[model samples]
Target: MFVNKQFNYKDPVNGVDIAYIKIPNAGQMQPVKAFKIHNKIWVIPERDTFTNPEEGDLNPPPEAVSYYDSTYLSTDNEKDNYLKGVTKLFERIYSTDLGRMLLTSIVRGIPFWGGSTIDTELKVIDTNCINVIQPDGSYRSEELNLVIIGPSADIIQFECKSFGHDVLNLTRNGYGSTQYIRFSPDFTFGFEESLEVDTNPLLGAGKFATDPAVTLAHELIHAEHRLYGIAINPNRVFKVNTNAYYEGLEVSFEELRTFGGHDAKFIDSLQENEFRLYYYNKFKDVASTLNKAKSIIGTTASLQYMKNVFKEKYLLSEDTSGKFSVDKLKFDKLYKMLTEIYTEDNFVNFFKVINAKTFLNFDKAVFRINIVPDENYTIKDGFNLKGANLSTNFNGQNTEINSRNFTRLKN
Candidate 1:
């Protein structure tokens, strides 16, 4: 007798009329314990409210206004309050046996080493303080909430919020410091609403907990790879071209095999004009061969082996469909390219076709050129090749190679 049961529904406090579906449990079901939800209210600092001169000035300076807006007066105040509350919650959470188990599970599942140890000092920084000024007279900062900095590794940030429609909005900005996935109330409720509660009691909670844990595992894998210089974590949004060299090292370390030859589909995808140009310029002087370049960038059989292990270990589940799976074929192609680059000196000659001077002259030019389409070109003309021309002599050659020949090189 196949029996099924579902959990009860909960309504969101927010006006959004949403519902959740629960999955049935057998004899062995336990609540997936994660960080607890905290109240989003802030207690204003006494000094900011009274003692600060800006509080007295009816017409405060813009900087003072900015400060107040960011601190006491902004909607972010709720977020800040929630984060502070959660920090206490985390202390409680991690200290408990269940919390310790969850943390241990995450750490063990990370698939790499050199990350911050549990109980290590964790520092949380406001996302607003991290500002980056662009060359085009613009500035941006990470919208992330708290950053965890410890003695052994880089800063780890958590952008915690109540799960809602805006979940994508939080991650949309891109990860700078290492990012870990955390669920918001809205997300949990939303998951519940999507599945039929009567049929699947464990559906909402299981899906919710499992998805974020997998994502967190992926990001932590990246963190370990970065710290040890054994894996690559390319920022797809930023289009980190130079980082690809390092990524190549990471790919090699993971021991992924390429589906095709060195110039297969996976390799072709990565060899976008800008990446190729940047890589050629950056490594041309250091070593001419692809093998030497991989060496400088760093690649080992152990790294590649780990990558394969991660693929098998993490991605082989019934729920793997919705999540991002490591592409073994691409890994294979990547492995081939890295191996060829490391072993064959002649492959370095490809750099001759890439203009180092022109490539380096433009900051992140490769990213801009590769991802963004040329507005000036017509449909028949396809992607604008003229804008990508780095070499005076190789202009037409690059146009042909970039637009035509390389596409056919897919494995």
Candidate 2:
């Protein structure tokens, strides 16, 4: 989107008085005709067969300069109000117990031993898909190259598809600060619209609106995976399958528990290690993917495994118009693997380590820490912590070492 240079925007100072935006055509750039309609900046990119580029600034008034998001405010007061709201949103989430845990341990303390932790600051942008903030308070899309995490690296990111939604949602690429997973409110105890998180601090306190409730927990889960204990939490070890959604379900569930939210109690009774324990999942609720509503068999298994299950169960001319289960022995094997990697005993011990008591002692710590640009501690996940099972995702560990014996987190 470029400026429509006819004394456009707010006087001498304003945003790109977006006259019209140029987009990719047959192979080159072409301009879509757009005129300032009142305060709204709508364009006619598709004058021909749906000829316009999908761009417009209707949400923000003419006085404001912005993009798909509210990037700028029309007046000084608007900016102040916008900032206030942003800070307030951040403040409530940070005030939560789990919130404090993230700010202190992960963001504040060096995440990488010998490494520096990049200060995780809060900044907002207009675009929703994997957003990043720009220097001029604008947002620039970050190139997401997923191939770097293929089987070749120590680890790659594992993302899943969504269920019946058009929007989409993780995994690290080379030099990647972190991975992501698109999570919604469904996985949690759910908002009782009657109260809507009602500022009550007590478990049974009055219900108030915690605007960032479930969503914030979703991101906090990712931060936990990076800082709390292992860079790749147990649920993340798909090696291959699962969409970004499932892990989010598990992590956010934990976040709620960490804060004593109602959702945690309900989710707690469920089994450990998630369904991926089987390495291949049992359930696959169908959902429209971020891929423009493409349907996907929602499971945490490799692409091939999913196909095999489909063929073996449905395409093989099998009878019955209903759903069914996988082989018993197969399920058991998967469960065994899941337990071995994710648990040690009756409790889910992996998450218990997030408490400061264990993490701070890392110098007396387990895995050898390396420094990253941000100063965060980068340690092997499941690393043979000398004798401490600090991180496990590493090479050259004696296979005989048992991680179960060395746990820092409690389910």
Candidate 3:
């Protein structure tokens, strides 16, 4: 059922593979998913029956579980009590269609919302015992914050973890990992508490706050960009020389970098809110997408929302003579046509197209839209209003609408 071996990857960029254990037939039937865990890539099968070597097999040969899940469902009184609260938050996440869509997209890389393929549903492996294959063809014990099985066959390892109680509320509700995602004690235990969100589009950006479930959903979007980087969409890569990976609808790199309490030095953010908002709107019974949109760097409830704010403050403003001028009727007709066809349902693809730039070899992606009236919009000379979203570029120059809904992209 498994093979421990090393081989050169067909893709030159992937380089040589390290010795690792992988289900032989799992990827043979189809192109399966893989995860980088403890510095090794693992090809896991999509099956409920396939248990990790540490979890103990149900068959006759195994003894008791050598490594039990000691974090999410630990027996330690304090951690257990705290994580039980986390369990409830996760339950809310899994209970809804939006939550399920985000989970399905991140955990499996399936494009439920502009993603790719869907694998079988996988279970969560909340354990401290992380096993990694070594160069000697033997397995080594490692420790990870958390690891969740993707779809039915894949597994994703997040550097993020939750433990203990936050009596002081010193830390924010959650935190991302150095590479992927981590968690704060507040996020782990404060399941019943409501995190205040910035729902006012006119207000300043701050900590992404909302219901515990939506908060988790928001962070998970950050997690995806960290894990996949420019691979999410090769075209969305930024042309800057800096070591940053993510490039989306935010012109100011500083604003995009400082998101979700992430340190600007390491990871990157993307248009993750668009995905979250769309799903949230679709599943209003769970939560409203505006709760996240109005608060985040870009007030992105929908393309319509972005259009309305941009037109009122940027295009129609009398002080905008210095910037590009647009006929009110033409602008209204164009935006009306654009927003109608590309409603919330088509938001996923619309977002991807708007941010789609050239590819780069980077490591993360995040979405931020900082559409301020101060910035100028690049209305192309003799540009005609059409029924489609438009992105204008001239020899890598920022467009007139650069700071509008579209982020000023570098070629």
Candidate 4:
């Protein structure tokens, strides 16, 4: 019952004072008094009494009435549980100033110019604001900026409804289309369940048992990408370390080779880019906490501070006798990678690094920590610790699945 009253509206408000208002997501409407503010009109729903009919709440425009379909929302249970769970996360984000900015990015989309130098027959010049790789050759230097689609209240209606993944033909834990988002049957509600830890998770558990907000944010990123037609130039060559042998001669060297640039294929595999932003938003909370405390001093302490903060936000339970041991080495590497690059500016500095091909290493590091499983474990062994399994259950015995306990805007 950790509810924020501002979000617990009888009808979702736009969080503004306007004389004439229309809320497509508002389940039902009742006439309320709207007071005038100086020269402008302000609608204050708190004015319960409507003595005069002329001064009552304005009726929604005829055009706005037809926007929502009868079945726009699939079921009441979904609105109460899944949708509510997401709103709680929204409330959490909207509570802070920086979080508001991050939330806006997810809603609207992040657009940037991918510019870099290209070697052509004529001369080498920077391709200014190139979104796609030029036919000849060029690398992209990523930039970060926000595109505000609308106000915060519009988020409730961003998706038509929350449905089971099967409804949307989704194999993954979650998927987002233009009008709706679907979640796996395994999805849970409530903030507590959202952050449940997994000691020995599935092969690519990053997508599993994630905070529903992160999944929502991920899907929103996809939705925004589609809505705004956002694009980024592909990286053709990446440097990788390898050892080569020429007739029994061994040599270690760094060779630049083409790793990506099949646009259609590469663009389809850009899930990691979504994660970079989602992680940046999530880590911002951790960063904000550290900043307020003023604890980060030197390199050693700064690294330790971030490490401690990470564990505080995401610490899993100690493994029991039957469970595979936690991979300390892998965990150490994950922490070091995170602290080394992101902590200096509380990850505010890494905003530009989100879609940069040069930061592929950093993306992979995040993937290993959040998605990939340790080599010692196999998913077939049923080592997955998330969801309702007897071995390791995220929600303890007898807990209601996807149930909401609080009251919301009534239909």
Candidate 5:
């Protein structure tokens, strides 16, 4: 098992105070007297470099060292300390309900490669690093170095580079088998640095605290794809090609069922939105079809038939829209179509049919949908609108109208 030890714990001459010191476990606890002198406390763990050793010698043989250095200095020491404090703060913040859920998802979603399971293993490392060049060309010094070691002998070494874009050149060597995660100062949202590939200021503070759950879910999905031989783009977003589309369909179907299973309200709401968007878009398509019917179809009767099709299938009346009379038959038809098209065997058939269509065209559109993850709003408002009609009215006013107006009213 991997264990962490604090060095110089008994040293009285270091002038350093060790507060909130913790040893996570107590298997073969190593002593702290084995290391050379340093200004900061070294919390080092012992492991075999090759095999996944249980408990070996506390110190290993000297080897080639990859030294990262830091030169830039901070004017505010307190700010520096606070920045350093974030690792602990984040761990504490995420240890609760949301964090547990995310961690669980990550572990279960990702596969085990015969080394160690995520449950029995923990990877802990520092979160700050500064790079400095050596004047004498000897070994460089690093201000911060985070060491991540899992029970499966998986090791990830991160060196936080706060310099210019020149660091991108370092990627030529490749990230190798190890997972390389970085936090850069360029996108720092008033925190010392940005934590991830691209830094967005909106991801700072409470947003970040709230995001770990979602971010972890997305990442864990990627990990699962990797483990299951599912192709994923390097961007970490799941590929949107034929293979991945079906994979996404499967995952989404499972998730929806697990999350909103047997809820009539959810089913009703899903149908309403599907119909609304379909009708809204289909109306424009019908208007175009009607205008071109005389030239292409050679009959006004065909145009009339198209109009009736739109009216019977997609049109929403004032009364139905007012009463929120969701067309269950149409909704179920769409759901069944989607379910059939997305299933593993059916997806293959759909893919063949889609490929055979000569006039097939694919266009992408961006839209935002609000999904409530928990009952926080429901408890406060006395109702949960998971998949219900966005325009559904209550107490003589449309809920969608109220939602839209509430923002302007608040401002």
Candidate 6:
């Protein structure tokens, strides 16, 4: 039972008046305690993460209009449609007061920004900040420094730009598009950039009380992949990280996401933009809005895929889900398998037989050897000393064999 207790509650006694806290996904929360000591504030649940379909695997945000078409997410009335979808997404997420509290915490934890770029034209301009938080919602205030969008007097929500580089824009419409994960034109040439940002919602000079936060969530998923453990590259070093560390990271978003029989979806799929799409899917009933989401496969297939993936992986629940916390249980198996692979060291040694004191001691597991224990007791060499001095009970009337307890040590 590998449990994730990393975000459990703690009493803070630091001396600062304001403390930045974190929220963990649902099914993962501790009673938050906020108090003061010497004109300072301490925080619990140090991080602010909430378990919404937006954070985990879900149908994935509806794809943006194709890149070549160039209008869906890039334009306002093109109906980025993220707002409606986000509304439903939250409704499904906050069926309880506690759930909504989690939601509220996330809303509060995020930074809000305002002041329109009035110059809708996309180009690198000296401006305000645009920092990006990962799926778990952690960002560097400095990245915002990198997102200079001209002068915006206000700062708000935690949150894009665009390029035809593929990870951020579409080359087609709702479907048949490349997922904006990465575009490696060559092994060494991976290029990804956000081509545009629709700032209509944030144009209000920093209105934190009630501005749609959906679109910001939509874009965070991309940053998670680029900066977090959503994807790992093992034995990876400089410029090549073997970097995806989900199972290793007790707090990474990938630690809790899985597919098919419980393993995380590390393999490639055009439909991998899960968090964003699931948020988008919640906007309308699948039965009525399946038409809105296009897929690489059959429409029916795509719909079923989205529905199951959404309700199963994305939704947070006590989940008598499939006789258990499907995500946790399946991940248990993966953890076990990984444990085995890491320790097995199969074929680590060439071949050896160097025991002489009454010899017959083989710890198969340590040796990374496989066997049917005693299906038929005959010492079988994963190697063989072919034609060596040998004696057999071949004609000895099937003298039933037993554990290696024979003194006749015959071949």
Per-residue alpha-carbon lDDT of candidate 1 for residues 1-411, written as tens digits (9 for 90 to 100) = 000111111212121111111111112222111111211111111112111223333233443101112222124343333333333323333443433433333232321211212222111123212232333434333222222211011011122221111221211111112222321211100011133345434221211111112222223333322221222223332222455446522222121111112322233455444443442332221111111111111123353343333334223211333222334444344323332322111211222222111111221111101111234221122222345542233332233333332121101
In candidate 6, where is summed lDDT lowest over 10 consecutive residues?
182-191
For model 5, how does the per-residue alpha-carbon lDDT over 1-411 read when each residue is reduced to its tens digit? Answer: 011223332333221222221122223333221121122212222221212224222232342312111211112332232222222222322344433333232222211111112322221111112112223323222222122211112111122111112222111111101111222111111001224565434321221101111222222223222221221122322122355436441123222221221321233456446533543343343333333333212123343443343334322222532221235465445333322222222221311111110001111111111112222112112112335332122210122222321111100
Predicted structure 4, TM vs. truth:
0.25
lDDT accuracy of residue 269 in candidate 6: 42
Candidate 6 stretches with Cα past 4 Å from truth are: 1-68, 73-76, 80-82, 94-128, 131-261, 265-411
Judge candidate 3 against the unseen true structure and give its global Cα lDDT, from 0 to 1: 0.27
Flag regions of model 2 displaced more than 4 Å.
1-80, 92-98, 106-208, 211-219, 222-262, 265-271, 274-411
lDDT digits (tens) for residues 279-352 of candidate 4 = 34433432333333423322243533443433332221223422222244543443233222212122122211
Clashing pairs in 4: 206-370, 206-371
Full-model lDDT for every candidate? 0.24, 0.25, 0.27, 0.26, 0.24, 0.22
Q: Largest lDDT belongs to which candidate?
A: 3
TM-score of each: 0.20, 0.25, 0.25, 0.25, 0.21, 0.18
Q: Is candidate 1 or candidate 3 better by lDDT?
A: 3
lDDT of 6 by residue, 36-77 (tens): 111111212111222232332312245431111112122222
In candidate 5 the C-alpha lDDT for residue 365 amounts to 16
RMSD of each: 24.3, 22.1, 25.5, 22.4, 26.8, 29.6
Give per-candidate clash totals: 36, 51, 26, 2, 8, 47
Stronger candidate by lDDT (4 vs 6): 4
